[PDB]
Design a binder for this molecule. Sequence first.
Ligand SMILES: NCc1ccnc(N)c1
Ligand SMILES: NCc1ccnc(N)c1
Ligand SMILES: NCc1ccnc(N)c1
Ligand SMILES: NCc1ccnc(N)c1
Lengths: 133, 133
Amino acid sequence: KNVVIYADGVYDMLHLGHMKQLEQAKKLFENTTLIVGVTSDNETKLFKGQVVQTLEERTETLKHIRWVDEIISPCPWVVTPEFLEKYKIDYVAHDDIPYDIYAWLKRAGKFKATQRTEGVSTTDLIVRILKNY
Amino acid sequence: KNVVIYADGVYDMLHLGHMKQLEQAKKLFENTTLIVGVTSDNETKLFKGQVVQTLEERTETLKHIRWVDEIISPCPWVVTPEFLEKYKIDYVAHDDIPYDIYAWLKRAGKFKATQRTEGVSTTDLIVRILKNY
Ligand SMILES: NCc1ccnc(N)c1
Ligand SMILES: NCc1ccnc(N)c1
Ligand SMILES: NCc1ccnc(N)c1
Ligand SMILES: NCc1ccnc(N)c1
């Protein structure tokens, strides 16, 4: 009955959007283990761009989040069939918002969609602070 | 054996410092319920000063934190003996960093000290972003 869910990401400056996404992945089935992968500094810079917090800082914040059961830090940038078998992962939870490399997961019945929440990012709150001066 | 711990605070723009403090309060005894109080917007402004996030925003983030068992939102600004009895609270966890109104708790054996962690605040990270331009 226990289902292993994997979600990966940068988790830079963790905000309520990340946390709601993690909650959604945790709650995809009644009984889950949610494994979170945290991307390396070098690979995040190479493929996505700047990152504000180091791998160690992004990983430490994640350990305080209720929905996170296990952490792979750092995690590989691209998910592979071999990775799923190594960690006995039953489903990969993704927002399907580009960053379709995941078609093979959908084909296999192993893709579970999650959503984002806008207007909650750390960035947006400095904007809220500054719109008082 | 279960001990009810109460920690209150603003919890504005929650960062790793808050989370480590909550972890410390949760882990003060083997078996605890950690109740977190979140201060009202009006009282935080009157007594401490500006607050960036609303009560609802600060409370929602807290529900995602692993160590938080129950939330009183909003909570009273000053802890009273009557409040401890109403909620069956065994100890109040505070950093003892001023903001001694807590002498009566120390007298009663109900004060448990927790510590802060500097350099982790949301504020500090924009400073880290800006020191690249
Ligand atoms: N490692 C995959 C990945 C990378 C960046 N952002 C994501 N959401 C997922
Ligand atoms: N940066 C990833 C992410 C996750 C959830 N919500 C967002 N708005 C963004
Ligand atoms: N409600 C008490 C209080 C108010 C502000 N900051 C704290 N840490 C505690
Ligand atoms: N603002 C309260 C607080 C809690 C923990 N650590 C800090 N540095 C500050």
